[model samples]
Target: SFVGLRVVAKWSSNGYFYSGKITRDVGAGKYKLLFDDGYECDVLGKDILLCDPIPLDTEVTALSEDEYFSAGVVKGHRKESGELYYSIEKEGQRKWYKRMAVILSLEQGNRLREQYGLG
Candidate 1:
């Protein structure tokens, strides 16, 4: 009954969240979403987050295979086996990293990297 409610929905392609509205229910846990950018798609109920996602343009640092921390910007996110992965973009490349591995500050990222004995 929450149809037509404005929401922030996750895009499956890149896992980025976008502003949209729940247009109608399509049975089960799925709903038709109309994005503000004129895109429409069926989204699972869980795809809607009650809170806004991290701003896309925000710079972040993410660990690369526990080897080191890399600087990048928040691009998107994806779910894997119930775990959330954040997509970080650097040098025109985008990669998914564990959510905890991505930090808002470079300093914190460096600190964690060293704590884990990573370069």
Candidate 2:
């Protein structure tokens, strides 16, 4: 029943949000908390931290972004000029998109923007 009460992640390291708690939130500041599970987290009041229900289902990558890099132009620069491309990978039976697309959906993104203005 946290409803309007701002959530403060009571954790250290990266808190694992499962089932009931999908995201952790905090106001502007730097902080940390020790969780019951014996974990610690560096709380940066930047964005709502999200959690994938299944951790082993997510993918991690070691890639960096370039200033003017576009998968579209790089990959689909020919044919119908389909110079567009994104990233996806899998391990075992789990698969996920790249950090680029890991952001937000059209609706969720716009709504989030409207909700958290000029952050």
lDDT of 2 by residue, 35-68 (tens): 3244445444333332221122222221234533
TM-score of 1: 0.44
- For candidate 1, write residues 1-119 as lDDT tens digits: 86877665667776655556789988888888898678999987766643233446656666677579767987886777987677888999988876546543423222323222111
Candidate 2 lDDT (Cα, 0 to 1): 0.28
Per-candidate Cα lDDT values, in order, are: 0.64, 0.28
Which runs in model 1 stand beyond 4 Å of their true positions?
Answer: 52-119
Report RMSD for candidate 1.
14.3
How many clashes show up in model 1? 0
How many residue pairs in model 2 have overlapping backbones?
13
Residue pairs that clash (backbone atoms under 3 angstroms), model 1: none
TM-score of each: 0.44, 0.23
User: Candidate 2 — which residues are off by over 4 angstroms?
Assistant: 1-27, 34-37, 52-58, 61-119
What does candidate 2 score on TM? 0.23
